[PDB]
Amino acid sequence: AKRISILSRAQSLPTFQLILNSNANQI
Amino acid sequence: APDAVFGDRVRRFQEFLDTFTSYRDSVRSIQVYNSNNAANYNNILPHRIIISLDDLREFDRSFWSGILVEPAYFIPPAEKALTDLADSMDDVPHPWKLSFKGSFGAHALSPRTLTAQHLNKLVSVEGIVTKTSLVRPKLIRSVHYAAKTGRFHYRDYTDATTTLTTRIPTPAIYPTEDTEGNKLTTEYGYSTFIDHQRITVQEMPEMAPAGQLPRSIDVILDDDLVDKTKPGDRVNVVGVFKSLGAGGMNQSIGFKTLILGNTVYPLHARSTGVAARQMLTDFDIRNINKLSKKKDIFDILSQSLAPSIYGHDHIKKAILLMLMGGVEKNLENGSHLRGDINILMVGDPSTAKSQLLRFVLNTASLAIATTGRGSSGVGLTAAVTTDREERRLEAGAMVLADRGVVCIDEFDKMTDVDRVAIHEVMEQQTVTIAKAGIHTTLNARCSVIAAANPVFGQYDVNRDPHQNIALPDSLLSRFDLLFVVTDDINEIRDRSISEHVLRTHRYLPPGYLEGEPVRERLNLSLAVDHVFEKFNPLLIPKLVTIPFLRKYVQYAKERVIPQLTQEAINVIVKNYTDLRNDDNTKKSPITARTLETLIRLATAHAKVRLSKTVNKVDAKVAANLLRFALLGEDI
Amino acid sequence: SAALPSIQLPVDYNNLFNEITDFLVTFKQDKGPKYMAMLQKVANRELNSVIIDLDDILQYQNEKFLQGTQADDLVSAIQQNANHFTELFCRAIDNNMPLPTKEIDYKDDVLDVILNQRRLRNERMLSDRTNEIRSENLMNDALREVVEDETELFPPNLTRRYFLYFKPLSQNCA
Ligand SMILES: Nc1ncnc2c1ncn2[C@@H]1O[C@H](COP(=O)(O)OP(=O)(O)O)[C@@H](O)[C@H]1O
Ligand code: BEF
Ligand SMILES: [Mg+2]
């Protein structure tokens, strides 16, 4: 994300959160 | 230790204050008012000021952004700048504090959207007050006296909630004895105590998600901001969203969060206790005075109450007189004479009675809307809540509508038991509890307006009005004007109704397209272009804008206190005697309440004309209204 | 910010850094610039010590003021706080260091070969990171910034061979 933001700045970020969506078997 | 960045921000804010001289003028007004009140006695107005965040954003984007997102570091410099400006201005021989208004952008929130990623920022939360802790004073400085040495010693005190910045936590113990060891006696009255109140703001039910538990946030109000509102109000509490406590990190689950109060704005919403006051400019007062001179002022105003509704002009006149009200009289012996007029509408369905009630709710300064049985006898008046934290009193509808209107709808569906409790409020304007060991007499000076269909669905000419109304004679007596309306099938009248309805439905708001749906506006007015409206559903009188009518009512109620005259008294007495001693099968029973309502209606008309005295024309108009209500005569 | 307060002081290190850089580049009084030639001699591994003549700085200030351009008092600032200006001059020199025209010939000091190895290694790391991030395909200025932020180079403190010294003002001139 840091790399992408700095690259796209041409015309600090906190720790990102991961969200896991799964379709596997449900206990 | 002095800080350079602090001084720089102080200088920047002093420059801002000098740029916008309105705040300097307001400070001068505060100080001269306090000095004058000091000189008069050989209400002190508080040391506060309002800062337009829009003006600040125009002046300096950096400072505006700093206050908005970094308030703990920007507010104290601005407060110190204001204090220095006040000291310099006060050439005539307790720091000042700031208050903020304007657009807060993304920080304008509600207790549901108040997440941790807004912490330590200036926020403007809006909601309904639900709890108000009783004002408990806080000890900030204690003065002690040493008997042996004969000198006074003091110690200053502070806590986390006092300071926006995190001052180093120092234990605050009470100075029991002096340094030399002598006994110390506390000197109350020299020690400085400051007020402190914790209020809880809940999300407004008007925009809370239906069916879900609510969200609440605590607000700590101190000094001038205490007791600013009561439970059941609507507030706009702007303040710093501080977070306190150790968070459990210290070895003893989350951090305690609350809003330090900078400003409290009681907000007017329909059917809420907060009154809707308005600012009267000199231009507005001049317009009101000029328009009051016309002889047809009563007709002009009455037409403007319900332009949408066709006809019912006598009902509209009665409603306007209700909005003006009468003058309540208090005598030395303690007797209180009602100065409020109550209107009851009985008629066929689809007679626009509920529409008139809704308009009265929408236009009065303080109105409360109730339905037939949804607001029970406990819901009306008041009743003890038996709260475990003990036997608190909760004000029902009518107590919350003090000096206001209660718009009861479907009066006929009301329970008999519910309408038993309404008699005292109607006449004596008080609510007596005398319950559970609580003996209290709440003040309920409310004007009641009700609509109720006849028992047989449609008014029956064949039956006498006593059979149709089916209300107790006492209740009908308490109601000043009992209007019996009907849906009569008449070709000319009905086609005129159709014309008016189709004209109303063919209206396009100025800032709208043809197929553009009309967007609902909550319109949470805050309790603090021409006079005439060009659009008219009914065509040629001059109709005034509803906000101008509200301004007119607000002016007339406060400024004018009419008094009776012998000329009006003779007319009132003659009308009363003629009504009482002539039998014409009147709709309502005729008692001394009829005399009282004649007096009150004359007073209301006098207030409309902005007359310091009640004249003959007021008496004639009041008698005409009463005769129209009872006999149906119309001239 | 309350624990460590702040003080505004008449010195601005950025303006003085610009003045230092300009003085180093454009001083000719003693054909080419004196200090640029000295730096060239240093780059060729001849001189190990750069002697910053304060009289040169004073003459530079006098020239700038005489023509009307406003130049801050660099000599006074150097005298008042000499330690910081040592590092200011050192970094200004490290920015403006030219490249050698005579390479290692097996007779150079071991310090010089170690410094050259470190310089080449950190340049190679920088270029390699630039190549990787460019190949990721997510302006070259942003690329340079991200690669210099993401790499651990040998600091410039470990790639300088010269020594920096200040010569005080001659009394007669002052
Ligand atoms: N005289 C009238 N002029 C204009 N609209 C009217 C009139 N009478 C009834 N209406 C319309 O008919 C509808 C019924 O009015 P409402 O107040 O709900 O009737 P009710 O007396 O049964 O409570 C509303 O949409 C209202 O606008
Ligand atoms: F049909 Be209505 F609301 F009296
Ligand atoms: Mg209705």
Q: In angstroms, what separates the terminal alpha carbons of chain C? A: 43 Å
Q: Which protein chains are joined by the largest interface, and how many residues does each one contribute?
A: A-C, 8 and 9 residues
Radius of gyration based on Cα positions of chain C:
20 Å
Strands of the widest sheet of chain B, in order across it, are 4-9-10-12-11
Order of helices and strands of chain C: HHEHHHHHE
Instruction: Tell me, briefly, the overall form of chain B.
Output: elongated
**Ligand names:** adenosine-5'-diphosphate, beryllium trifluoride ion, magnesium ion
Radius of gyration of chain B: 30 Å
- Provide the helix percentage of chain B: 25-40%
PDB class: replication
Keywords: Helicase, Activation, Kinase, Phosphorylation, replication
Entry title: Structure of MCM2-7 DH complexed with Cdc7-Dbf4 in the presence of ADP:BeF3, state I
Chain A: Minichromosome maintenance protein 5
Walkthrough of the structure:
- The structure is cut from a larger assembly and holds chains A (27 residues), B (635 residues) and C (174 residues).
- Helices cover 30% and strands 0% of the residues of chain A.
- Chain A has one helix spanning 2-9.
- Chain A is elongated and about 50 Å long.
- Among the domains of chain B are: 2-107, 2-Layer Sandwich (mini-chromosome maintenance (MCM) complex, chain A, domain 1), CATH 3.30.1640; 108-137 and 195-269, no CATH class; 138-194, no CATH class.
- Chain B contains 19 helices and 25 strands.
- In chain B, α1 (4-19) packs across α5 (71-89) and α18 packs across α19 (616-630).
- Chain B is elongated.
- Chain B starts with a helix and ends in a 5-residue tail after the last helix.
- Chain C is 55% helix and 6% strand.
- Chain C has a two-stranded parallel sheet with strand order 1-2.
- Chain C contains seven helices and two strands.
- The longest helix of chain C is centred in the C-terminal third of the chain and has 27 residues, at 110-136.
- The A-C interface holds A 2-4, 6-10 and C 133, 136, 138-139, 141-143, 145-146.
- Bound molecules: adenosine-5'-diphosphate, beryllium trifluoride ion and magnesium ion.
- The site of magnesium ion has 4 residues of chain B, from α9.
